[PDB]
């Protein structure tokens, strides 16, 4: 009813239940003026929405109809590894019942994907991939409820012969862009505004592609990161959302009219091809070129809503007991790369730490390359880059780390087990760039 948007069909939970069987398929859709065949969850790109609520029991069983094996990653979600199982292998033809419980605090944006070692960036390029939302209390405020929300699944493609395009060996070293620059697996969809407040989930689900955001004539109000809530409203012309990030902001439509989102030109020091060359530049391949998202249509005579003045404390947390070093390296040449000089062996532990107890990693990237460092199972505390403080206090799971920068991290350590980090440029995850932790 009223205009309609492209948004992935939502499943929600029920009495405390959210049970689903989900295949992965290769499934012929139509796609930005065409028919291709991607490999989805449940039928569509991107998969299905997942919507639940604290407490919630979510028994997702994944039916693997591909013809290579796979397995789920439950991106941000604080539960035991043995259940989001890094190492897990479900084998073509077969099905593994994923069960877990909602943690009592979360909020905010998830969202599941393949993570077989070796095939991740193939995979996730073909379109297996979809988001998780955990509703919270805090969305009954009237400066929350009475917005208009919408999830935006930021995930490009590139197709050649009706399938996703294949991996190049220029693919494995930068991370594989493509030219389709989509939106809930749309080209530029408009969105039709009824209310003058709309509350955005984003979600950047791409192989490597970064999203400089920027909405025309209009700043953005982040109220939530990739974990969780922020302590309130934090006010910013444009946001950066690196591959595996999310955000929630509210935007405050003040003026009747058509605004684009935008991608705006950001240079992530990707390498172009050559040497051989014009006169000075040709083998960095430089910033982005902008990108339009979408086109977004103000309801006439807009009155937004006020900002909410709170949202959630962040708890403190107590003083860490272990500093660890994760350097980030690259030999581009060879597309591999390294955390503290090794490649990733799922017969290595490369760290041990105990659980319930908060340690401080300090992330240094020695490359040229933005790398996106993900942690499994632990949500951590940004405190600083670069040795100056991060914007908010919120849980993430993503941190980018610009050539040459440090992050300090607070990870409370929870759940028991044996977990992966990596960079979330998947591309070097399969190339290297991952290695393993284990709580006791
Ligand atoms: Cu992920
Ligand atoms: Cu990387």
Redesign the pocket.
């Known amino acids: 009813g009223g205009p309609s948007f492209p948004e992935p069909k939502v499943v929600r939970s029920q009495g405390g239940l959210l049970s689903l069987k989900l295949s992965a398929t290769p499934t012929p859709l139509a796609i930005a003026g065409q028919r291709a065949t991607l490999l989805t969850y449940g039928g569509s790109f991107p998969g299905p929405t997942l919507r639940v609520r604290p407490r919630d029991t979510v028994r997702l069983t994944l039916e693997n109809r591909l013809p290579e094996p796979t397995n789920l990653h439950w991106h941000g979600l604080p539960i035991s590894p043995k259940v989001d199982d890094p190492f897990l292998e479900i084998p073509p033809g077969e099905s593994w019942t994923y069960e877990f419980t909602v943690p009592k605090e979360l909020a905010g944006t998830f969202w599941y994907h393949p993570h077989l070692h070796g095939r991740v960036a193939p995979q996730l390029f073909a379109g297996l991939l979809g988001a998780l939302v955990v509703e919270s209390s805090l969305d009954a405020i009237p400066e929350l409820r009475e917005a208009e929300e919408h999830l935006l699944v930021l995930k490009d493609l590139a197709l050649q012969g009706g399938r996703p395009a294949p991996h190049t060996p220029m693919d494995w070293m930068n991370g594989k862009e493509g030219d389709l620059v989509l939106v809930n697996g749309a080209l530029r969809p408009t969105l039709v505004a009824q209310k003058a407040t709309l509350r955005l989930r984003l979600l950047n689900a791409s192989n490597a592609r970064y999203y400089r955001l920027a909405l025309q004539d209009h700043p953005l109000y982040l109220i939530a990161a990739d974990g969780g809530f922020l302590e309130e409203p934090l006010e910013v012309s444009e946001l950066l959302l690196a591959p595996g990030e999310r955000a929630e902001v509210l935007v405050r439509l003040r003026k009747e009219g058509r605004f684009l989102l935008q991608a705006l030109p950001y240079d992530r020091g990707a390498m172009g091809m050559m040497d051989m060359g014009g006169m000075a530049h040709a083998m960095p391949q430089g910033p982005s070129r902008p990108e339009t998202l979408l086109y977004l249509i103000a309801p006439k005579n807009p009155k937004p809503l006020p900002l909410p003045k709170a949202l959630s404390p962040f708890p403190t947390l107590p003083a860490p007991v272990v500093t660890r070093r994760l350097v980030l390296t690259e030999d581009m040449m060879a597309a591999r790369?390294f955390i503290n000089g090794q490649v990733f062996d799922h017969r290595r532990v490369d760290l041990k730490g105990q659980a319930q107890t908060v340690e401080v990693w300090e992330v240094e990237n020695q490359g040229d390359?933005d790398?996106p460092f993900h942690l499994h199972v632990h949500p951590f505390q940004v405190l600083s880059v670069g040795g100056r403080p991060f914007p908010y206090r919120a849980w993430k799971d993503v941190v980018n780390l610009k050539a040459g920068e440090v992050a300090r991290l607070l990870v409370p350590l929870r759940e028991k087990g044996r977990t992966v980090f990596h960079?979330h440029?998947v591309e070097?995850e399969d190339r290297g760039?991952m290695g393993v932790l284990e709580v006791g």
Request: with cysteine; proline share 0%.
């Open positions: 790369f390359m790398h960079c440029i070097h760039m």
